[PDB]
């Protein structure tokens, strides 16, 4: 491929990265309508350092990789069968989508109430800021996407159980539990983070009863069980604080776009959009106002972003279904459809704006169809 469009552009004369150019057709040769300076809105997990441990791995995309995303960061984590992501907590709230396999999670709230449940493919979980939790993969192992509500998420964000104890005077730990220093001499000298372990037993046998009672709302959500908004070119499954009650700082939508379809032109009136492409290939043009617009290409891995209120669409440019997540740091999901907007205004008023006739306004729909 060459960066040539009509009589514009020229062949590349210096050493280049042909593989990446092939993955970014609309960047090497952008639409003629693209214009102006626009921040980078794309980053691949494959371009990140992968932390390998006995039991799995973890790689992250943060504000240090994608500057525009100051409010959200993400981790792609993998766990082998039975492997455990060590009991820990962090300042940020955590949202997750199980892409592959299944896992058991635990969480205890500030009132001493515990919640333990199994999460399968298509399920989610949300852990409020500061509440301690753990993850243990089941027999198929597990691979999932985690999203934290602070783009600066890093190493100083997570507190591990064994790391805390390893940095607390032995005499203090002993006094705290009413045991002798000798009784805790075998405590780990360093954190585990992720470690291999035998598969757990049935969920029912793990449930712990307590004098504090059951938690008010579940920390897991079966996203694929509910009826999705079904459009002609695909479907959308939404989970925000209105249905997944505990998910107060993260609103999400799983979008599936069939080949030849596209997430329609729209924008969000509430906040920024963070994206993760699960599968397929796409292109999206972000309209930043004042004659500024830039097109980006995305595929599998890839993290995407759409700053607050910017116009956009997500077109499937491949032969397989396009599947991606739309994440928002807010208590609700909300969007304004260009089509629906115009459909709900006087026909002659819209015609006056677009310099088009009734033949165009007649195609407008008062019903919102997310994917066309």
SS3 annotation, the chain: CCCEECCEECCCCCCCCHHHHHHCHHHHCCCCCCECCCCCCEECHHHCCCEEECCEEEEEECCCCCCCCCCCEEEEEEECCCCEEEEEEECCCEEEEEEEEEEEEEEECCCCCEEEEEEECCEEEEECCCCCEEEEEEEEEEEEEEEECCCCCCHHHEEEHHHHHHCCCHHHHHHHHCCCCHHHCCCCCCCCCEECCCCCCCHHHHCCCCCCCCCCCCCEEEHHHCCCEECCCEEEEEECCCCCCCCCCCEEEEEEECCCCEEEEEECCCCCEEEEEEECEEEEEEEEECCEEEEEEEECCCEEEECCCCEEEEEECCCCCEEEEEEECCCCCCCEEHHHHHHCCCHHHHHHHHCCCHHHHCCCCCCCCCEC
339 lies in the site for a second copy, by CB under 8 A: yes
322 lies in the site for a second copy, by CB under 8 A: no
35 lies in the site for Mg ion, by CB under 5 A: yes
Q: Which does 123 bind (CB under 5 to 8 A by kind): a second copy, Mg ion, Mn ion, none?
A: none
Is 320 among the residues known to form the active site? Answer: no
Query: Which residue lies nearer to a second copy by CB, 105 or 244?
Result: 105
287 lies in the site for a second copy, by CB under 8 A: yes
Smallest separation, CB 317 to Mn ion (Å): 17
Smallest separation, CB 146 to Mn ion (Å): 7
Among the listed residues 123, 150, 273, 315, the single contact to a second copy using CB under 8 A: 315
Q: Is 92 annotated as a binding residue?
A: no
Counting residues that bind Mn ion (by CB under 5 A) gives: 2
Please tell me which residue in 60, 65, 92, 326 is annotated as part of the active site. Answer: 326
Query: Which residue lies nearer to Mg ion by CB, 15 or 291?
Result: 291
37 lies in the site for a second copy, by CB under 8 A: yes
Among the listed residues 117, 118, 206, 331, the single contact to a second copy using CB under 8 A: 206
Query: Which residue lies nearer to Mg ion by CB, 35 or 248?
Result: 35
Smallest separation, CB 215 to a second copy (Å): 11
Query: Which residue lies nearer to a second copy by CB, 211 or 225?
Result: 211
Q: Is 273 annotated as a binding residue?
A: yes
Q: Is 353 annotated as a binding residue?
A: no
Smallest separation, CB 36 to Mg ion (Å): 7
346 lies in the site for a second copy, by CB under 8 A: yes
Binding site for Mg ion (CB under 5 A): 35, 291
Residues tagged in the binding site annotation for Mn(2+):
88, 90, 94, 133, 266, 268, 273, 312
Catalytic residues: 326
């Amino acid at each position: 491929p060459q960066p040539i469009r009509g009589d514009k552009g020229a062949t590349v004369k210096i050493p280049r990265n042909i593989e990446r150019d092939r993955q970014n057709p609309d960047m090497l040769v952008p639409p003629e309508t693209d214009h102006g300076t626009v921040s980078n809105m794309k980053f691949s997990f494959s371009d990140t350092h992968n932390r390998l441990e006995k039991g799995g791995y973890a790689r992250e995309v943060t504000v240090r990789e994608l500057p525009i995303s100051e409010n959200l960061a993400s981790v792609n984590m993998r766990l082998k069968p039975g492997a455990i992501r060590e009991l820990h907590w962090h300042k940020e709230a955590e949202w997750a989508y199980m892409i592959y396999g299944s896992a058991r999670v635990t969480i205890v709230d500030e009132k001493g109430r515990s919640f333990i449940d199994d999460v399968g493919e298509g399920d989610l979980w949300y852990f409020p800021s500061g509440l301690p939790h753990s993850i243990q993969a089941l027999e198929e192992g597990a691979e999932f996407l985690l999203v934290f509500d602070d783009g600066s998420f890093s190493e100083n964000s997570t507190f591990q159980l064994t790391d805390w104890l390893a940095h607390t005077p032995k005499e203090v730990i002993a006094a705290n539990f009413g045991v002798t220093k000798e009784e805790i001499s075998n405590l780990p000298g360093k954190e585990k983070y992720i470690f291999e372990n035998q598969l757990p037993g049935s969920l029912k046998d793990d449930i712990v009863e307590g004098p504090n009672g059951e938690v008010p709302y579940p920390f897991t959500y079966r996203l694929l069980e509910q009826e999705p908004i079904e459009s002609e070119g695909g479907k959308v499954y939404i989970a925000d604080s209105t249905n997944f009650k505990v998910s107060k700082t993260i609103a999400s939508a799983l979008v599936t776009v069939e080949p030849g379809a596209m997430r329609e032109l729209h924008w969000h009136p509430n906040t920024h959009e963070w994206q993760y492409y699960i599968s397929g290939k796409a292109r999206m043009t972000v309209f930043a106002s004042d004659g500024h617009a830039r097109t980006f290409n995305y595929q599998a891995g890839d993290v995407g972003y759409v700053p607050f209120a910017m116009g956009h669409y997500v077109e499937n440019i491949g032969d397989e279904p396009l599947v991606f997540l739309e994440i928002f740091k807010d208590d609700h999901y909300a969007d304004v459809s260009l089509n629906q907007w115009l459909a709900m205004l006087p026909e002659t008023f819209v015609q006056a704006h677009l310099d088009l006739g009734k033949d165009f306004t007649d195609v407008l729909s008062k019903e919102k169809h997310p994917v066309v």
